[PDB]
């Protein structure tokens, strides 16, 4: 499980990274590209559940194909998702902490 949560969180973060970029006034195409590469990078890696990761790849391929204050919204979204992400990782730590404690 613990492997499948890490690779899951990475992809979700990289997806969020890409939304932050898309939600900006002037989308940094190079960055988006770099981020799209990291995603398929981290994914392909994890791809070696194997169906769900295959399903992710299939779904990512489709997002890619459809990919096109406004900068204020982008930054607030980024702010919010990092905190939610960190909230989960905090709680998740408190558990691996507990598992060990036993």
- Residues lying near its own copies in the complex (CB under 8 A): 1-2, 4-5, 7-9, 11-12, 15, 19, 49, 52-53, 55-56, 59-60, 62-63, 65-70, 72-73, 75-77, 79-81, 83-88, 90-92, 94-95, 98-99
* Residue 19: half-sphere exposure toward Cβ, Cα within 13 Å: 15
Q: Minimum distance from CB of 5 to its own copies (Å)?
A: 5
Closest CA to 40 of 62, 73, 71: 62
Return d(Cα 88, Cα 26) in angstroms, integer.
Answer: 31
Q: Minimum distance from CB of 25 to its own copies (Å)?
A: 10
């Amino acid at each position: 499980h613990y492997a499948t949560i890490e690779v899951s969180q990475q992809l979700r973060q990289l997806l969020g990274d890409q939304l932050v970029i898309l939600l900006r006034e002037t989308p940094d195409g190079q960055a988006l590209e770099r981020s799209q590469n990291d995603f398929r990078r981290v994914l392909e890696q994890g791809r070696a559940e194997q169906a769900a990761l295959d399903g992710v790849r299939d779904a990512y391929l489709q997002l890619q194909a459809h990919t096109p204050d406004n900068d204020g919204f982008s930054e607030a979204f980024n702010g919010l998702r990092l905190r939610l992400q960190d909230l989960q990782q905090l709680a998740l730590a408190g558990i691996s902490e507990a598992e060990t404690s036993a």
